[PDB]
Write an enzyme that holds these catalytic residues in place. Structure first.
Site, PDB file in Angstrom:
ATOM      1  N   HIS A  61       6.168  -0.312 -12.312  1.00 52.06           N
ATOM      2  CA  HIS A  61       6.204   1.113 -12.622  1.00 52.06           C
ATOM      3  C   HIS A  61       7.608   1.676 -12.435  1.00 52.06           C
ATOM      4  O   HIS A  61       8.013   2.593 -13.150  1.00 52.06           O
ATOM      5  CB  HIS A  61       5.169   1.871 -11.794  1.00 52.06           C
ATOM      6  CG  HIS A  61       3.769   1.382 -12.019  1.00 52.06           C
ATOM      7  ND1 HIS A  61       3.213   0.356 -11.284  1.00 52.06           N
ATOM      8  CD2 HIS A  61       2.850   1.708 -12.958  1.00 52.06           C
ATOM      9  CE1 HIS A  61       1.988   0.117 -11.719  1.00 52.06           C
ATOM     10  NE2 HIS A  61       1.744   0.924 -12.735  1.00 52.06           N
ATOM     11  N   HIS A  91      13.541   4.771  -5.121  1.00 53.39           N
ATOM     12  CA  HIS A  91      13.303   4.356  -6.493  1.00 53.39           C
ATOM     13  C   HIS A  91      13.657   5.531  -7.376  1.00 53.39           C
ATOM     14  O   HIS A  91      13.955   6.631  -6.890  1.00 53.39           O
ATOM     15  CB  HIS A  91      11.840   3.988  -6.742  1.00 53.39           C
ATOM     16  CG  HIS A  91      10.899   5.107  -6.451  1.00 53.39           C
ATOM     17  ND1 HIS A  91      10.440   5.381  -5.176  1.00 53.39           N
ATOM     18  CD2 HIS A  91      10.410   6.084  -7.248  1.00 53.39           C
ATOM     19  CE1 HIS A  91       9.658   6.449  -5.216  1.00 53.39           C
ATOM     20  NE2 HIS A  91       9.643   6.906  -6.461  1.00 53.39           N
ATOM     21  N   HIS A  93      12.773   7.623 -11.328  1.00 61.08           N
ATOM     22  CA  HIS A  93      11.980   7.871 -12.528  1.00 61.08           C
ATOM     23  C   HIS A  93      12.972   8.283 -13.602  1.00 61.08           C
ATOM     24  O   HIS A  93      13.899   9.048 -13.324  1.00 61.08           O
ATOM     25  CB  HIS A  93      11.017   9.043 -12.268  1.00 61.08           C
ATOM     26  CG  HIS A  93      10.073   8.804 -11.132  1.00 61.08           C
ATOM     27  ND1 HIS A  93       8.852   8.176 -11.281  1.00 61.08           N
ATOM     28  CD2 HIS A  93      10.247   8.976  -9.804  1.00 61.08           C
ATOM     29  CE1 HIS A  93       8.269   8.076 -10.092  1.00 61.08           C
ATOM     30  NE2 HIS A  93       9.106   8.538  -9.179  1.00 61.08           N
ATOM     31  N   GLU A 103      10.949  14.193 -12.752  1.00 56.14           N
ATOM     32  CA  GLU A 103       9.570  14.606 -12.506  1.00 56.14           C
ATOM     33  C   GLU A 103       9.521  16.084 -12.156  1.00 56.14           C
ATOM     34  O   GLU A 103       8.870  16.875 -12.850  1.00 56.14           O
ATOM     35  CB  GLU A 103       8.941  13.743 -11.411  1.00 56.14           C
ATOM     36  CG  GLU A 103       8.913  12.288 -11.811  1.00 56.14           C
ATOM     37  CD  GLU A 103       7.925  11.476 -11.006  1.00 56.14           C
ATOM     38  OE1 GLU A 103       7.990  11.410  -9.761  1.00 56.14           O
ATOM     39  OE2 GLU A 103       7.037  10.918 -11.671  1.00 56.14           O
ATOM     40  N   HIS A 116      14.115   9.210  -5.747  1.00 52.28           N
ATOM     41  CA  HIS A 116      13.206   9.507  -4.638  1.00 52.28           C
ATOM     42  C   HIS A 116      13.545   8.601  -3.472  1.00 52.28           C
ATOM     43  O   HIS A 116      13.311   7.391  -3.541  1.00 52.28           O
ATOM     44  CB  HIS A 116      11.752   9.333  -5.067  1.00 52.28           C
ATOM     45  CG  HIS A 116      11.328  10.388  -6.026  1.00 52.28           C
ATOM     46  ND1 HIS A 116      10.218  10.279  -6.832  1.00 52.28           N
ATOM     47  CD2 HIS A 116      11.869  11.602  -6.283  1.00 52.28           C
ATOM     48  CE1 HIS A 116      10.098  11.381  -7.556  1.00 52.28           C
ATOM     49  NE2 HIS A 116      11.088  12.196  -7.246  1.00 52.28           N
ATOM     50  N   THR A 195       3.763  11.042  -6.493  1.00 50.90           N
ATOM     51  CA  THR A 195       3.679  11.323  -7.925  1.00 50.90           C
ATOM     52  C   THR A 195       3.138  10.144  -8.713  1.00 50.90           C
ATOM     53  O   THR A 195       3.073  10.212  -9.941  1.00 50.90           O
ATOM     54  CB  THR A 195       5.041  11.677  -8.504  1.00 50.90           C
ATOM     55  OG1 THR A 195       5.889  10.527  -8.437  1.00 50.90           O
ATOM     56  CG2 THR A 195       5.673  12.820  -7.727  1.00 50.90           C
TER      57      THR A 195
HETATM   58  N1  LIG Z   1       7.082   8.847  -6.583  1.00 51.02           N
HETATM   59  S1  LIG Z   1       6.956   9.274  -4.965  1.00 51.02           S
HETATM   60  O1  LIG Z   1       6.049  10.586  -4.898  1.00 51.02           O
HETATM   61  O2  LIG Z   1       8.411   9.424  -4.306  1.00 51.02           O
HETATM   62  C1  LIG Z   1       6.135   7.972  -4.063  1.00 51.02           C
HETATM   63  C2  LIG Z   1       6.577   7.656  -2.800  1.00 51.02           C
HETATM   64  C3  LIG Z   1       5.946   6.651  -2.098  1.00 51.02           C
HETATM   65  C4  LIG Z   1       4.884   5.992  -2.674  1.00 51.02           C
HETATM   66  O3  LIG Z   1       4.257   4.988  -1.950  1.00 51.02           O
HETATM   67  C5  LIG Z   1       4.452   6.330  -3.942  1.00 51.02           C
HETATM   68  N2  LIG Z   1       3.371   5.694  -4.642  1.00 51.02           N
HETATM   69  C6  LIG Z   1       3.169   4.274  -4.586  1.00 51.02           C
HETATM   70  O4  LIG Z   1       3.863   3.557  -3.936  1.00 51.02           O
HETATM   71  N3  LIG Z   1       2.064   3.766  -5.360  1.00 51.02           N
HETATM   72  C7  LIG Z   1       1.770   2.348  -5.384  1.00 51.02           C
HETATM   73  C8  LIG Z   1       2.596   1.742  -6.519  1.00 51.02           C
HETATM   74  C9  LIG Z   1       3.468   2.553  -7.238  1.00 51.02           C
HETATM   75  C10 LIG Z   1       4.210   1.988  -8.260  1.00 51.02           C
HETATM   76  N4  LIG Z   1       4.087   0.707  -8.549  1.00 51.02           N
HETATM   77  C11 LIG Z   1       3.265  -0.086  -7.882  1.00 51.02           C
HETATM   78  C12 LIG Z   1       2.488   0.396  -6.841  1.00 51.02           C
HETATM   79  C13 LIG Z   1       5.094   7.321  -4.651  1.00 51.02           C
HETATM   80 ZN   LIG Z   2       8.984   8.686  -7.171  1.00 54.04          ZN
END
Ligand SMILES: NS(=O)(=O)c1ccc(O)c(NC(=O)NCc2ccncc2)c1
Ligand SMILES: [Zn+2]
EC number: 4.2.1.1
Length: 257
Positions: A61, A91, A93, A103, A116, A195
């Site tokens: 993702h 990471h 987006h 986002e 993020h 998100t």
């Molecule tokens: N975008 S965020 O709000 O900074 C954020 C911060 C920490 C997080 O743990 C997540 N969400 C995930 O990690 N979901 C499991 C996953 C996501 C993508 N690919 C594979 C598994 C989103």
């Molecule tokens: Zn994120």
């Protein structure tokens, strides 16, 4: 499973993750004129001098740069936060075009990408416990606009060839996340969610006012990643952003007037 395509993208997520329609979902549009200046907000304290990056991972993702969070090495404190939050990973987006990818939006404006930096509240012992708590995470969000290169991002860009496809990881030590920070730490803050699924409502969002600029070539290299695993049909990892969600009864606070 969930993703960002036509049949499994953000408008579909509520079927597996009903909290997608919850009361504190992220991201949101940051309407800078309705944001409330709060004089009681403390300056952010970003202590990344001792950060220890370990590796970089394509999870299908996005790509995550992961850090050793077994001690208070890279911590976020202050601002709206009570106590200390530890950096676990960052990471991004991003978009298929420079005109979209972030986002959060600012007065409906979309940036080319959004970084993020994910931190967890140390009073909960680890990330897995913290995500189950309403104050478990603090995510520092930083917008990327396309312009001059960001030299501190280049080491990330250069390793992406090693993790083109879902499930690939690479050693990624000695990366200094301070090279990704803009000059000012002025911020907006609001309570929200992850998100991506599981969309848990555990995040204090801290979104910096000042974007960093990255070059067109830097963000193009993001777009050469793949959502798919190796030996599966190639689908470029682009537009891996969730659109803005309703603010509902939340007020966004600003550390600056
Ligand atoms: N975008 S965020 O709000 O900074 C954020 C911060 C920490 C997080 O743990 C997540 N969400 C995930 O990690 N979901 C499991 C996953 C996501 C993508 N690919 C594979 C598994 C989103
Ligand atoms: Zn994120």
């Amino acid at each position: 499973h969930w993703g960002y395509g036509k049949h499994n993208g953000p408008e579909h997520w509520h079927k597996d993750f009903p909290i997608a329609k919850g009361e504190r979902q992220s991201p949101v549009d940051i309407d800078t004129h309705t944001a409330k200046y709060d004089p009681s907000l403390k300056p952010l304290s970003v202590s990344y001098d001792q950060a220890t990056s370990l590796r970089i991972l394509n999870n299908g993702h996005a790509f995550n740069v992961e850090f050793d969070d077994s001690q208070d090495k890279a911590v976020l404190k202050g601002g709206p936060l009570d106590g200390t939050y530890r950096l676990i990973q960052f990471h991004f987006h991003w978009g298929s075009l420079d005109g979209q990818g972030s986002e959060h939006t600012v007065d409906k404006k979309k940036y080319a990408a959004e970084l993020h930096l994910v931190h967890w509240n140390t009073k909960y012992g680890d990330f897995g416990k913290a995500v189950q708590q309403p104050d478990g995470l603090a995510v520092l969000g930083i917008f990327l606009k396309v312009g001059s290169a960001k030299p501190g991002l280049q080491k990330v860009v250069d390793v992406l060839d090693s993790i083109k496809t879902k499930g690939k990881s690479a050693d990624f030590t000695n990366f200094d996340p301070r090279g990704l920070l803009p000059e000012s730490l002025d911020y907006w803050t609001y309570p929200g969610s992850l998100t991506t699924p599981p969309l848990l409502e555990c995040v204090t969002w801290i979104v910096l006012k000042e974007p960093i600029s990255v070059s067109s070539e830097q963000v193009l290299k993001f777009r050469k990643l793949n959502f798919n695993g190796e030996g599966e049909p190639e689908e470029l990892m682009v537009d891996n952003w969730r659109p803005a969600q309703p603010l509902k009864n939340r007020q966004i606070k600003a550390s600056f007037k």
